[PDB]
Ligand binder design. Structure first.
Ligand SMILES: C[C@H]1O[C@H](O[C@H]2[C@H](O)[C@@H](O)[C@@H](O[C@H]3[C@H](O)[C@@H](O)[C@H](O)O[C@@H]3CO)O[C@@H]2CO)[C@H](O)[C@@H](O)[C@@H]1N[C@H]1C=C(CO)[C@@H](O)[C@H](O)[C@H]1O
Ligand SMILES: [Ca+2]
Ligand SMILES: [Ca+2]
Length: 686
């Protein structure tokens, strides 16, 4: 099927995501509304249920409100059954309107709708070619106090009705009991409790297995994507095994949230996006866009930089979800500011690279500070606001113009307040000009583009004050003045004669799994896919078409491969690097080493003979290991994702600068379990 098909759950670059807070969208059914001091039908107290439900979105999909806007994917609240407690955090009552206080990952939250209400939703969405992404928060359950088992629901957890246990009297060790985090370190913020949320222990097989069976159930119901909450507060090694489980079953576009601030850029943030098996929410985009288009704390050369720095730092930049604001930051639109800033910021996000995400209510100029302020109810549904129009005219370009979805970015003209950039994928082009200045016009002299001779009409139709572009000979355009706050989008689309890859999903799976390659130029008849030097053809290619090829991963040794395509006429595509074929199914193993004495600047790492363990290369060793919470120095520990049911070999090492110190003795061997978890306890051998 084509790359734009609703059946394409692996990739979302050609989609526009509408982020909804079920509760604060539309109450399509009152019979299911919570009652008592948990309900606030006037959405006056923003920490209470307002009544929104799934039937409320089915209504907005049916009467054409969402569809008429151009949206092709809704991202909703956690569908999982929550605690029913009305928590009075010092004077203020609080409820689980946000879906983030899980109670039973196998049942739906009654207030949002029933199991039948969920199928209806998946079916009304798909029948209108809209994809559904859900939230999943496997890092915890709900507010719990072990000292006072009378608080909330005591962080209890049920398995489809059966109680597994609570935060008080945890003999089975389902949770962590190390106090709460002060966010001092990454280690600290992972094993310690986030504020007061009963932190789950994934080293416990019962927990590990339960969360994995839970996500599959949700995959079986029809979801097309997953947004995992708090990726920074769970162990990396477990997440990889959680991903390998999704991808090895029914892969869906999965992404997670890792909050970055202003001009804050961490390498762990990138390492996660590059090696977890899942992408992140592009906070590097969001904060930079708001600095230039909103707070005006940086100029266009910072925008240029960011767009360029990203095209390299991320391994698969086309998979990062972009946005201008959301549930974790103040609303982009202010009181003392004009709607133009918002109108432009939206256009910039819509034509830029990644998976664009619009936080509900942005098209109705909703204003509001931090939580719960940024989570008020959508005041209206007027399909005639300019912002509605902008999204309306731009959104479908992602599915029609391959350059918007997969193309590279090139700044063709730049200034302190104006930028003109090009997105191109083969012959397809899209030029976007923006003058953020509202006072002075911008005379553009000598603008060269990839557009062929012609005079292109603004796709925005002038509502953003955009002109038409007369492109003469050599892609050069006649001079023009870009009006203050002007914005224009010009484009060109044509067939692809050369195979070209725009994206691949999933980015890691075991042999025998079907991956999805998307692009243009693949051709009608079956061709050839290269995983490294290993060529795949015949029955192993499940599907071939001009825009999308589906092929099984061949039996190769685990490791990183470069993907490449060749049509039936030997025309080979560009290289799509960084594909991880795993050794097989994964399980998480905690490795604990005792007596590793280290110097100031020396850390302990691990390595072994399978690719998930770096394949003996000390530059790809797992680490630096942990040494303060679950175990303290001189004992180090780490949760690592390894192949299931195999005898792996490994040795620990110390690393300091360019100096590496290996353990003495013989290689350690270990037979991994087929499911669940395992813990290896050892002592440093000199
Ligand atoms: C509140 C939020 O905090 C934890 O994770 C991140 C946030 O996602 C991140 O945005 C940042 O928090 C705020 C930031 O400090 C502030 O300067 C900025 O203006 O806005 C941010 C959002 O408020 O930093 C923290 C990490 O230090 C949790 O991991 C998130 O899950 C949490 N949001 C969840 C959690 C709870 C639990 O109480 C819900 O109450 C909340 O509604 C839900 O969204
Ligand atoms: Ca309701
Ligand atoms: Ca945790």
């Amino acid at each position: 099927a084509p790359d734009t098909s609703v059946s394409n759950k692996q990739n979302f670059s050609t989609d526009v995501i509408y982020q909804i807070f079920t509760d604060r969208f539309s109450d399509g059914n009152p019979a299911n509304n919570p009652t008592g001091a948990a309900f606030d039908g006037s959405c006056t107290n923003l920490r209470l249920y307002c009544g929104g439900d799934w039937q409320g979105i089915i209504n907005k999909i049916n009467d054409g409100y969402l569809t008429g806007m151009g949206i092709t994917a809704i991202w909703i609240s956690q569908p999982v059954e929550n605690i029913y407690s009305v928590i009075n955090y010092s004077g203020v009552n609080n409820t689980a309107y946000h879906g983030l206080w899980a109670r039973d990952f196998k049942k739906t939250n009654p207030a949002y709708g029933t199991m039948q209400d969920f199928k209806n939703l998946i079916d009304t969405a798909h029948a209108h070619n809209i994809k559904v992404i859900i939230d999943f928060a496997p890092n915890h359950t709900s507010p719990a106090s072990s000292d006072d088992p009378s608080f909330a629901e005591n962080g209890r957890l049920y398995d489809n009705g059966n109680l597994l246990g609570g935060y008080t009297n945890d003999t089975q060790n389902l949770f962590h009991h190390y106090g709460g985090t002060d966010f001092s370190t990454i280690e600290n913020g992972i094993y310690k409790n986030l504020y007061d949320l009963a932190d789950l222990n994934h080293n416990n097989s019962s927990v590990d297995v339960y969360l994995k069976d839970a996500i599959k159930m949700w995959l079986d119901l029809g979801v097309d994507g997953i947004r995992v909450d708090a990726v920074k507060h769970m162990p990396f090694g477990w997440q990889k095994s959680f991903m390998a489980t999704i991808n090895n079953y029914k892969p869906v576009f999965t992404f997670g949230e890792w909050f970055l601030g202003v001009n804050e850029i961490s390498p762990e943030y990138h390492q996660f996006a590059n090696e977890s098996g899942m992408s992140l929410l592009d906070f590097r985009f969001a904060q930079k866009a708001r600095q230039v288009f909103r707070d005006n704390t940086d100029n266009m050369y910072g925008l240029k930089a960011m767009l360029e720095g990203s095209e390299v730092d991320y391994a698969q930049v086309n998979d990062q979800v972009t946005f201008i604001d959301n549930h974790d930051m103040e609303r982009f639109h202010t009181s003392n500011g004009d709607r133009r800033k918002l109108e432009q910021a939206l256009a910039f996000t819509l034509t830029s690279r990644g998976v664009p995400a619009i936080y509900y209510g942005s098209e109705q100029y909703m204003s509001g500070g931090n939580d719960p302020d940024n989570r008020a109810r959508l005041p209206s549904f007027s399909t005639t606001t300019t912002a509605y129009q902008v999204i309306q005219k731009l959104a479908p370009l992602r599915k029609s113009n391959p350059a918007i979805a997969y193309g590279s970015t090139h700044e063709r003209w730049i200034n302190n307040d104006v930028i003109i950039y090009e997105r191109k994928f083969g012959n397809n082009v899209a030029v976007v000009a923006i003058n953020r200045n509202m006072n002075t016009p911008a005379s553009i002299t000598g603008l060269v583009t990839s557009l062929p001779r012609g005079s292109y009409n603004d796709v925005l139709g002038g509502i953003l004050n955009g002109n038409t572009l007369t492109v003469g000979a050599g892609g050069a355009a006649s001079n023009f003045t870009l009006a203050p706050g002007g914005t224009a989008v010009w484009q060109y689309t044509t067939d692809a004669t050369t195979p070209i890859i725009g994206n691949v999903g999933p980015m890691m799976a075991k042999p025998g799994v079907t991956i999805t390659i998307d692009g243009r130029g693949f051709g009608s008849g079956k061709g050839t896919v290269y995983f490294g030097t290993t060529a795949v053809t015949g029955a192993d290619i499940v599907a071939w078409e001009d825009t999308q090829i589906q092929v099984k991963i061949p039996a190769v040794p685990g490791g990183i491969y470069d993907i490449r395509v060749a049509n039936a006429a030997g025309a080979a595509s560009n290289i799509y690097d960084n594909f991880e074929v795993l050794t097989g199914d994964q399980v998480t193993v905690r490795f604990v080493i005792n007596n590793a004495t280290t110097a100031l600047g020396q850390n302990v790492f691990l390595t072994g003979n399978v690719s998930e363990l770096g394949n003996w290369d000390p530059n790809n060793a797992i680490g630096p290991m942990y040494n303060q919470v679950v175990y303290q120095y001189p004992t180090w520990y780490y949760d690592v994702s390894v192949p299931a049911g195999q005898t792996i070999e490994f040795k620990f090492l110390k690393k300091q600068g360019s100096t590496v110190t290996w353990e003495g003795g013989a290689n350690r061997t270990f037979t991994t379990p087929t499911s669940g978890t395992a813990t290896v306890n050892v002592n440093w051998q000199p």
